[PDB]
Amino acid sequence: CRALIKRIQAMIPKG
């Protein structure tokens, strides 16, 4: 769990 994982999670569950 890394960089674009935090781009997608910024959209998906806020983490």
Side-chain angles (χ1 to χ4, degrees):
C1 297
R2 52 71 179 184
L4 116 142
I5 299 92
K6 279 30 171 182
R7 295 296 291 106
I8 65 88
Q9 298 187 272
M11 307 298 173
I12 289 138
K14 286 103 294 306

